[PDB]
Design a protein around this ligand. Structure first.
Ligand SMILES: Nc1ncnc2c1ncn2[C@@H]1O[C@H](COP(=O)(O)OP(=O)(O)OP(O)(O)=S)[C@@H](O)[C@H]1O
Ligand SMILES: Nc1ncnc2c1ncn2[C@@H]1O[C@H](COP(=O)(O)OP(=O)(O)OP(O)(O)=S)[C@@H](O)[C@H]1O
Ligand SMILES: [Mg+2]
Ligand SMILES: [Mg+2]
Lengths: 277, 271, 277, 277, 278, 276, 277
DNA sequence: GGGGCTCGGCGCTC
DNA sequence: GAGCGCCGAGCCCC
């Protein structure tokens, strides 16, 4: 393994070591942590691209040493779980907190195999986007499926940890790729103006107001892809309209909820409609 | 053949040797095998392009010694088969194990000619992507026909050993091009932001839940004459595990020692 | 004017070596001497020099020989009844002497406006076998890009034989095609090049769907029938070859074309090749 | 990971200066010191440094600075009578040392839910003179486009102060305004952009009308008066200003705060302000 | 603040100062003022971008952050102003040369408050086109009120050191906005394909052969806004016709005129019609 | 602000050269000197230098030079050998009278009579005279009267304008009376903002009466006198020989050079007095 | 002004060489010398000098050299019995010397309005073998592209010879067609370019029908035949050539158009070329 | 759905 | 290395 030993090489190695230690995975965090370093590294033209390269290398080295559970699950219990917004929404909706929390934990770790996405389906103003945002932002680098663009939808989901599909239906053009990335199957997807890369199994969380198991194409809907999708989804149907002035789901709430999940884990039947009784 | 002799050329010849001798083909594998090596080569633009050049050259060098049959057949015997998972998948549906195994083995060596594509077709949760992914990852290089991007579909199938068309449907924009790769025909395909390149014959696995020998029917006969068809129809359980990267080798290697003549046909005969 | 420097000496040695060995693509270059390719890829001027060397060597070989030099053979044929092209053309009916004369004429650019041979027939009859044998008997051969629309006839520039594998005559490229398939000069697009030009070269189409009927969206306009038929001969193959029949090796192509030059006979300018003997 | 060099030192000094002056775009730089702008904008190595420096100044100021930093002046003030707003306070009775103390607590967010200001009085009463000066002072300032019902608070994101000129309250934005007017974190919809969170930003309002009255079509309701009376102060500037008093210069703003920080007095948490008897 | 000091920096500073001073907003004027400098700076690839950057900076620095009189009052004093055509144009129409010139200076300096306009009125070929052009072209940046375009009549009136309302015909749709501008009051105007911009107090000059006090609204004419309008403009009615060989006025002459004004100012009033020397 | 250096000095020399010899496109450069162009195109540095030199020279000659290049530098001892002289002499026009008028037309000396209308049948030297003189000055325009929308599109910043086979039309009569009147007038340009045309002497070769405004199937002479107050008409009736040849750029310069040395008074008449 | 160094001298030598041997594309460069071309691709400087050299040589030729300057070869001609054009002409009824003289006049622009020569006759008569021989014997040439009705002559600008290979004449460009065929300047519209003037250039036409036919929508009118026949010296190929007749080499064309000048004969301006000595 | 529209990341050339 | 520039792949509007 040749190891370049120039001055630029030494500076770059030190920078990426510091970045991987301090968990910095974006400029914003850098400028929040050490202002002098960033201002200095923007003071030329060699280092301007070196910044982007360093951030990408830090992202790669973190993604290959820490998976989703490392960040999500917390390190201390809560000792009183009712203020958690997540628990209150999943309780008032009807599901019991134990089984609902076991399913979430078994979805961060991929213990469930093909079922690699949790589908939140509820009328407007129920919590879908809130929980999705919390679980998506609690990780270093998440991914959003650009459902508007139909020729390169999963373009930012290369080398990520948690994918989040915010809205939209399952068009007849993205069903073929969705069945691959939702199913946690290693494939090689198309990259804009570049060659293909590999998408390792990444858990997904889809929030929508309209059904995804019946593909929709313009003025016609299809049902041949209803079993293959329904066998790779959990379907949390959240109905009760969330009261006004309900606190933004704060990262610490997500960490504590998942920690309580790991504390009271209970086995969950491997089915589509998550048991609610 | 002028051999450039300098410092940079020697270092590059040292990097490509290390890459080939360690089976490294992608950056991720480079990081896993050695971290300081990769973190160094992103420093300057020279090395940043040298990384891509070295990976491509290592890929080419590995291919010009080997082929698919040299990776998919293990170096040790089986001594027990009923525990295997490809065997179980093929036995549940009724297919005689060794007949279909001979079909697979011949499909790997290109012994059948124009018919070098296995089409696994069946209802949901039957065991198609399992076998397909096991076979595709047992080999170092594998392509995947792009579903979207109907202008450069077969861009990732230029110098690969085993193609894997996942959840594919035959649209009229790919039929005329899929009539070349699925038949091992030596043709020059279009690449992106690069000059056209040549595709040597390559086996192809197709796993589709919908009929794939009909364009959406004038191309039914020419398409169903370059693919076998294994109609898997038994719903599996969730305890049934993944086809490990080592079970494929055991299956194909148990095949090489019990090969049987396979009747050239579109519908692989049950029983 | 001969630029005499060290780099010019290296380049001249490289091009002379390539022409003496017969390399026309990078893959063969590696396959002959790996050290050469790896070294000439190391540096930053590397890629430019490799691309220029390949293009220049191909140009030299193309100017120093033509299609008949490669296709025709220097040794005679003891008995042609074994060669598979003869059997393909005899099962269907065509008298092999007449068809051999037609093939030899098309190779040597001698029939004027009918500069192409069209093979058409139901599935598994023998089209692609003959086409690929002929195409690979010549060191250089082009192929039309089926899907790409912004650069359709790329890779057909300065080749010896053009091989349209399974093409369909789309309305986008009907004019440029009506000109390339006619032994004339056309203005074609290219990648990162300034509107290069196509020399008049033989073309061998092997589509199993009608090639003289243009398709417009979901419509088929027969307007362009006469312009296309007046510049192509047609071999209507019907018989169904069986497996374990083998592919036409290059030696067979050379032997057949040689057996033509020694037995040539006249042929009328007719779209439908005279079906009999 | 600090780049020590000449260009690095110059860039650090420049961006520190920029964040010190709150300069964001060039035009402001020109107005502050033209010679620096020129001297930088000559060579090709500097014409990119300027853009990068403006971007870095913007980011540093946004992510690590608040309004009271750019408002509170530096040099101590010996006289405040000459202060123009002071006169606009004394002339209209409002005790300067008290009425001035009102803003500072609003500047430093010391009044929590009462994190907004409303200047009251007829036209030609310096309201927009006291707003614009206390609306342009901060580096990034937002203006409430109450006329645009869809996106009234579009420009209030990533700011340090929010301007409301001739503000009129409508029932459609009353719920949105109360969150903004109360200094509470809230998310607003941006045109052609995702919803963004408006962090507590001391807002300023100028309207000769009554901000406690909600206008809904042809009906006006006071149901949100007290809710709107608990979120902001109110100064009635009856005395019209002379035609020669002019505007309020930035210096006349800052010096007032530097004087309003050295003469602090206890302020009340009431809706209205008290006038010096 | 930071200032870079290098060999290139000194030359660039000199160039931008020279540009802001001479009034060289664009290249072509650079050619017309010193061809040697342009033919020189165009030589290499390090100067062929220096030119464009210098022009951008100069246009910006001048158009903003500087006052219009700064290129209407010259430097070298004027001994004999009678030779100046304007002195002849005003003298020809019985306009006391010293009074109007004093009125001219005040209008440029905004000293005449809301009366921020000069309306050269009368038939054609009476100096109205000559003066306006000579004065409008004099300043670095100027615009022409596009009254014909109702949507954005004042699109090109932003950051214009002088506004020339050529053959103006004020309409009912622009009367309100015109009064604020004609009054020199800060007003926001809509720009085509751009956000609304504010027009700081900016002088005007109106040349027309129709009465501006009349509001043209379709087939009806109303003088309702007559009094406010006449409180925002002066009236230098020019009736005498000029000779065919009179010729155009030069910025050299215009400079002299407005320079003579500063040396021959006199007390002035704020009525609507300029008094003619009896 | 003067940048001085070897490159700057050579560039200034080249641009003085180009502005002196009236060069505005590469083709003309190869014609006047192929060796210079071949030499310059060698290095990758000088390509941009050539492009900049050509554009800058064109702009300079546009904005700081006048049309009377028509006057040569060296004196003309003999002018009898000039085709233009022979043409004018052959057409009953006194060489010192029509040359003097010609000169006053180049210098705009006539105020309003800004154009020289060449009249007569084909092959009488009209087109040659216009094509010869017009190709003399660096920049010149062609009146595209066939294009009603933008007939004077190519008449902006032109040292000389040509109206080849012109035909007055009602739509363009007002604009044409403005141009031929040597008066500044703004014209509409295709895909460009309206531009002003400064006074530019004009030369016309036609066989139709320009004083006859054409409007569909009707012809009106209402604009006769105003147009007749804007032209210096010439009637070239004699037919030229086949081997007469074109007028060389050296001849046109020689002709006007003789005129400058033999200036005589001219009368602003709609008909140039022939030599009795 | 003239730059002088070693680089300038080398480029001057190269451009002189190209203009002497009449080169306008790489292929010809390799044909006339190989070590020259291979040398100039080594470095990037040479690979950029090649394009400029070809452009400048092409220009200088199109400006200062005319059609006869290359059609009439530079070396003497001894035997004129063998030349393929000579044999073809003697195989129809034309005196070879007289036909050579008429072609020469068509080259040196001698017959005035009759500035075109027309190759008429049935298929397989060798129209291509002639036109493509002459048209290849001048540095540049163009092909009348009637498929582009907007700019049929867009490829016939600054050409020393023009090839009317195929396509009929449209009514919309009859005047321009007469101008081109009549050796008269004419401004033609160019695609994506300003109108360009086509100087008097000889034209060569290859037709199996009457090109005088003029298409006006659905109407084909011969009213323009007489104006055209006064503008064209026509040749009417009598019968079919032998397919083994060979190809008229460039050297054969040079020999023909050199022996023509050495033995010019008087011509008569009839529409047809006299069929005798 | 078929035309043009600029745009982005890259190469390549200086 | 700067920068420069181009260009194809890609994108959007009518
Ligand atoms: N990552 C995994 N972990 C555990 N089991 C897995 C995993 N991936 C697949 N399986 C098993 O694979 C079995 C069948 O899955 P698949 O092979 O994907 O079926 P399939 O035929 O491909 O379904 P489709 O809809 O046709 S793609 C399931 O019963 C799972 O137990
Ligand atoms: N930043 C925030 N501050 C305060 N409340 C918030 C914030 N973000 C979300 N909420 C609350 O989140 C609750 C539920 O919002 P959502 O989950 O977005 O409802 P939703 O309709 O399921 O989302 P959609 O349909 O995907 S837009 C609302 O009642 C808000 O009060
Ligand atoms: Mg699958
Ligand atoms: Mg085929």
């Amino acid at each position: 393994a040749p190891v370049i030993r120039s001055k630029t090489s030494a500076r770059y190695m030190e920078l990426v070591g510091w970045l991987v230690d301090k968990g910095i995975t974006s400029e914003k965090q850098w400028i929040q942590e050490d202002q002098a370093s960033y201002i200095s590294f923007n003071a030329a033209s060699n280092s301007r691209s070196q910044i982007k390269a360093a951030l990408d290398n830090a992202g790669k080295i973190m993604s290959l040493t820490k998976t989703a559970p490392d960040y999500l699950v917390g390190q201390q219990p809560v000792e009183d779980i009712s203020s958690n917004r997540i628990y209150k929404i999943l309780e008032l909706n009807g599901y019991d907190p134990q089984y609902a929390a076991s399913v979430f934990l078994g979805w961060a770790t991929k213990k469930f195999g093909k079922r690699n996405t949790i589908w939140l389906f509820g009328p407007a103003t129920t919590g879908k986007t809130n929980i999705a945002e919390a679980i998506a932002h609690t990780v270093p680098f998440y991914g959003c499926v650009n459902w508007t663009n139909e020729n390169f939808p999963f373009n930012d989901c290369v080398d990520k940890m948690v994918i989040w599909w915010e809205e939209g239906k399952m068009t007849a053009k993205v069903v073929e790729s969705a069945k691959a990335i939702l199913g946690g199957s290693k494939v090689r997807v198309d990259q804009k103006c570049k060659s293909s890369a590999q998408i390792d199994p990444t858990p997904v969380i889809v929030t929508s107001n309209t059904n995804m198991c019946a593909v929709i194409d313009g003025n016609s809907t299809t049902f041949e892809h209803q079993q293959p999708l329904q066998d790779r989804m959990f379907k949390f149907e959240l109905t009760r309209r969330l009261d006004h002035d309900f606190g933004k789901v704060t990262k610490q709430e997500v960490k504590d909820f998942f920690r309580w999940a790991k504390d009271h884990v209970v086995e969950v039947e491997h089915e589509f409609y998550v048991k609610k009784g």
